[model samples]
Target: MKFVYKEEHPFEKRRSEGEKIRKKYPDRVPVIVEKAPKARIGDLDKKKYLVPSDLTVGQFYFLIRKRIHLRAEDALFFFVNNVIPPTSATMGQLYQEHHEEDFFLYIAYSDESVYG
Candidate 1:
């Protein structure tokens, strides 16, 4: 029989998924707090997290997406200080670089999209 390997399954996928989130960062999570331009309607005011000082930002995205149940087809995107961050960027780097007086790497993520 042949064998098969696979990448993470969509929402079913980090820093790993919702609860897998803490598994990766329980003791000392790489926390990311939301800082939005507009007032948050229903989402949590702020959240703190961590996922190995070495995991990718995308890992954080996947975890947050699963946490918030973002619609996968809409294409979610994350940004900070009006700049789009590379998913390949590590959570550790962002946490340290964006760390502010409040001590959170402020971030904003959205799934609404438009096209011409």
Candidate 2:
């Protein structure tokens, strides 16, 4: 069924929900990607991302770019499990779907990872 518009102040409701979730998992989520042993992307040697609880995949892309120090023109894609969830996909949704053992989310970048 389609959700009907009911709230007079919808944004406050959203903000309230966000606050609720943020309080539950106070620790921002963690991310691990498939990389060569001790791969060093920028100063992030393990390529692990400690993402805040309030970002979407798209938002995470921007954060990842900064973490990896990529340019606006850089061509890169992020994945969870094995699928590239859209940038619009929320971290909470991803966590709910792909969080491993309720601990961390495993991600992979690019199609590259040589078995050194």
Backbone steric clashes in candidate 2, count: 1
What stretches of model 2 exceed 4 Å from their correct place? 1-24, 34-43, 46-48, 111-116
Which stretches in model 1 have alpha-carbon errors above 4 Å? 1-30, 35-46, 112-116
The candidate maximizing lDDT is 2
Q: Scored by Cα lDDT, where does model 2 land?
A: 0.56
Task: Give the alpha carbon lDDT tens digit for every residue of 4-116 in model 2.
Answer: 22133264664554455446757676555553333344433454455666688777777767867878866556556546778787776776688654355666555223222
Q: Write the per-residue lDDT of candidate 1 for residues 1-116, one digit (tens) a residue.
A: 01011122232332234355445555443355453434332354345554576788788777776776665654666665546678898776766676443343556665432211
